[PDB]
């Protein structure tokens, strides 16, 4: 089934800088990728759906892009509340699967 690779597993950036998390699918999944944020002790939170579509309640700072096998979740000017783990999840083919996760460090 579809393997989603998130690398690097840890990303370190300077306050206010531009960060980009990467998710690579083992085969083509159009734009059927979704992004979640899970802070320490929290439950996952949907950030972007279908690779680039915004969700209500999520800061405008968050954006996504890509199609096919390569996907990026971007954060314009990262801040402290963004410190968390980030997961991608694909719904193109059964069963749904999750990437292994990227931790954001500031």
């Amino acid at each position: 089934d579809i393997l989603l690779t998130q690398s690097p597993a840890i990303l370190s950036v300077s306050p206010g800088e531009r960060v980009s998390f990467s998710c690579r699918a083992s085969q083509s999944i159009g734009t059927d990728i979704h992004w979640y944020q899970q802070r320490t002790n929290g439950s996952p939170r949907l950030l972007i759906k279908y690779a680039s579509e915004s969700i209500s309640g999520i800061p405008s700072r968050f954006s996504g892009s890509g199609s096919g096998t390569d996907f990026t979740l971007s954060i314009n000017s990262v801040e402290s509340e963004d410190i968390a783990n980030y997961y991608c999840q694909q719904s193109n083919r059964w069963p749904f699967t999750f990437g292994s996760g990227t931790k954001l460090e500031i």
Binding site: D1, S91, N92, R93, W94, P95
Partner: peptide, 12 residues
């Protein structure tokens, strides 16, 4: 019918 079959795409 299709969810539950590995590789199926007719699932949303």
């Amino acid at each position: 019918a299709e969810r539950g079959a590995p590789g199926a795409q007719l699932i949303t």
